[PDB]
Design a protein around this ligand. Structure first.
Ligand SMILES: [Cl-]
Ligand SMILES: [Cl-]
Lengths: 163, 162
């Protein structure tokens, strides 16, 4: 199956859990969603961290038509952990091989979860910008830990018509 | 500095496989990518390619697109080269500025594994790099880049289109 990891868009400065997306944050995120739809991308489901920042990013993705289903999961919060998400969320879901799922979260959570899925442990070697995305292919059978593959990693700027 | 690893474009199917050249669609696709890279304001101080025809033809298309003015080639980028010799006898010597942006045109799994070595210190075979696909890395201006670099971009040709 395909897992897409999207970092929330630019939010206001300084609880931080309530910081909302700023004007440029919404604009940039909208541009990303538009380009994705233009490319013909779609997600069966979008799962988001409960923090406002993420939820608002997820809403923009939905409004663009990228998906029609939304779910919030505490696993995606800054204090969540991939192992519980894998065993108590992903595995039970029993998604088909052709599934395309997007998760909207935070750093360094997303990059680390990615390194764990690719390498087997966090390494902090990936640069994931706000409204940026990572595309991974996870195995159907067995744990995806250290057995996944990355086919996409991009910041918002490289999704624009010119830069 | 920044490192841009580009796998060669589509070539003929399996004479000597080292002489296999790009296909009509391979040249086209690569041109689209090059032109796209231009619009994305991408500039390369130098384009270093593998001696094999597949790579060189892909590197020439990138050079022609105006992506760069210099085109050099090293055997280290050949299917049988090793990252460590390339780093000591090519990269280190060049002594590029911390603001340099170099493009490398090579083959798989060399490019993907070299990236993994630079990011994690060892190859893992976890990255998918398509032909004419590209990977963007950031190397620290201090110390060895082995297991100390950062990746900020990885995309296949299809996601580069509008
Ligand atoms: Cl960006
Ligand atoms: Cl492609």
């Amino acid at each position: 199956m395909e897992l897409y990891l999207i970092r929330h868009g630019i939010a206001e400065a300084q609880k931080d859990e309530e910081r909302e997306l700023t004007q440029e944050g919404k604009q940039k995120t909208e541009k990303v969603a538009y380009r994705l739809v233009k490319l013909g991308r779609q997600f069966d489901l979008i799962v988001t961290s409960p923090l406002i920042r993420a939820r608002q990013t997820a809403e923009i993705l939905l409004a663009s038509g990228l998906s029609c289903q939304l779910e919030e999961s505490n696993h995606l919060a800054p204090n969540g952990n991939i192992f519980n998400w894998l065993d108590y969320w992903l595995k039970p879901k029993n998604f088909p091989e052709n599934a395309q799922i997007a998760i909207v979260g935070h750093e360094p959570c997303l990059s680390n979860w990615t390194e764990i899925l690719l390498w087997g442990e966090a390494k902090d070697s990936l640069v994931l910008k706000k409204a940026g995305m990572i595309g991974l292919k996870l195995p159907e059978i067995g744990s995806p830990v250290g057995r996944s593959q990355m086919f996409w990693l991009t910041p918002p700027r490289y999704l624009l018509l010119e830069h």
